[PDB]
Amino acid sequence: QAVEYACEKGHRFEMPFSVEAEIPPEWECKVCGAQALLVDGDGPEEKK
């Protein structure tokens, strides 16, 4: 149960969210510096 974000740097990272939340389709890249697109955001974090 973790959300997965992928930055335009090419890196993917997971962050803790609510599994009953509407996971934001994009988030700031905590890894390197970019806008990271949320992947598999069906609803639950690790729904996929």
Rounded CA separation 25/39 (Å): 7
Give the pairing of strands 26-28 and 3-7: unpaired
CA–centroid distance for 2 within its chain: 8
Question: What is the total residue count of the chain?
Answer: 48
Q: Is there a binding annotation on residue 1?
A: no
Residue spans of the domains in the chain: they are 1-48
Superfamily of domain 1-48: RNA polymerase-binding protein A (2.20.28.270)
Rounded CA separation 47/35 (Å): 22
- The conformation of residue 46, written as its DSSP 8-state character, comes to T
Q: Is there a binding annotation on residue 7?
A: yes
Which among 43, 19, 41 is positioned nearest to 6, based on CA atoms? 41
- The conformation of residue 32, written as its DSSP 8-state character, comes to S
Q: Is there a binding annotation on residue 37?
A: no
Structure-solving method: NMR
Q: Is there a binding annotation on residue 34?
A: no
